[model samples]
Target: HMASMKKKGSVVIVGRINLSGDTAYAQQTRGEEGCQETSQTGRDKNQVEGEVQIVSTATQTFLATSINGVLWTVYHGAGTRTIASPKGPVTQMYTNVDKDLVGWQAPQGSRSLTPCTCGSSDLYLVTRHADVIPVRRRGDSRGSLLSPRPISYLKGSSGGPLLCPAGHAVGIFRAAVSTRGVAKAVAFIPVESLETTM
Candidate 1:
């Protein structure tokens, strides 16, 4: 029961993505609980490996990153819609899923605050291999053109939720912003932005 409960909040591995904008299949932007599983494999020409988690089944949207271009949405075939902004790499896609088979849990509510005010020691980077490592909120990349680049790279980290010390999610992980090949800090899409759009 414990393991199964945890699994319900995990992410879905995306094997293929439709960015060509052709109606080869039924793609969309909302639906039942669960992540959309693509039939295309890694060897397929349309393959674009990524990870997406069910941010809100009630809203019928999944979250992921469109890497090459920060805030772009890739098609999940026909029957799905996608949204983006801050242009943070965090994006939402629409479509239906199998409630039981796919990882679907009510997404955690958003928690917003600065470390000084919320207790910096309690903040951490949500990871699986080890413990939830502590990472500072260097700055917000979505702020402006002069904003400092976020610098913390986690392999296959896109779509992961950014949780606050309060057990609530603050945003969605996009990537670690880096300069001169050195990861400086982490980049993520704020939960507030996502909530307003949906």
Candidate 2:
């Protein structure tokens, strides 16, 4: 292995997912090829992707990050970009939290998403060694940084669900958390990261 390089997928899924609940992935998603028009506009890169996941079919939204200064434009302008796989424009940009992580709402895809779990204390980013490295270190990037809910809850709606209103996989990672949520845990692993890591 070479000495100098940056890391990605440091994030791995911890804990055994049960039959009822499990992790989300890009492949399982059903709507990428349609966004060719969105990409045809001559955007910065030919292929645009992220570690974003579908969290809400009801609200027609999902979770993603500004990831430092890189994506502040899309997050700030709103609707400026489109999600490929689930092809749609981002509508809302949960602004109450810090920039470390944030939520992006998209037009729901053809699939009805089951949603991931967030805010629940049991959550942990993927790790290395003891966890193995299908993906390497999940930089505290958004993990542990995720605070428990009392310090915060969506400054917005609770959920359209019953008692366990935690949420439909859509909150800012690393910010305050709550099962009262599970909206934005799935992510779009950047394709470049795949090339470098492999």
Candidate 3:
């Protein structure tokens, strides 16, 4: 009888579940119970938006973007390719960084005490072996391949993972850059930090 009562009152928690077709699996931004759904087709063009999802009961984080043109979404488990574009439906494409694609090495600088400002060398390059991927819409010609040249920028997306070479997601995109040529340093609340916090 005790076991039966305990089981009856026990609560269950499931991780993010993927949605089907052109729909996206997102959680409500508001403080509410359960998950919510939104059509990936209705967003404006070249725009990026964030959906805060419940990764765990204690760890709620942003999921993916709802933009099409640019490749701001990537990393593992970034939800299904929902939005469709002329280039193609945003499909999962992976690549390793080659020598030619290699560019700016990670700036040897302080990782902390740096305020958000232009010209600050807080940005670190994807070190050699850093596994980078691009989440592109269906048919898009320019997709993320393993190369040094940055294919995705961090201006409009949020909660996207930044993985180290060992395939460990080290950071997540939180902000944007103002300059034209440079890709935003993609402010990340380091995954390592999350481990300690959790």
CA lDDT of each candidate? 0.33, 0.25, 0.27
What is the Cα-based lDDT of residue 121 in candidate 2?
Answer: 30
Residue-level lDDT tens digits of model 3 in 48-158: 122111221122233331111122222322333323222323333321121101011111210111122232222332211222344221111111222223424332234
TM-score for model 2?
0.26
Compare the candidates by lDDT and give the number of the best one: 1
Task: Give the true-structure RMSD of model 3.
Answer: 18.7
In terms of lDDT, which candidate is stronger, 1 or 3? 1
Q: Write the per-residue lDDT of candidate 1 for residues 23-125, one digit (tens) a residue.
A: 2121333233223222111111121222222222222233443221222221221123222111211223322221101111122221122212232223344
lDDT-best of 2 and 3? 3
Instruction: Give the TM-score comparing model 1 with the true structure, all chains together.
Output: 0.38
Clashes of each: 22, 23, 16
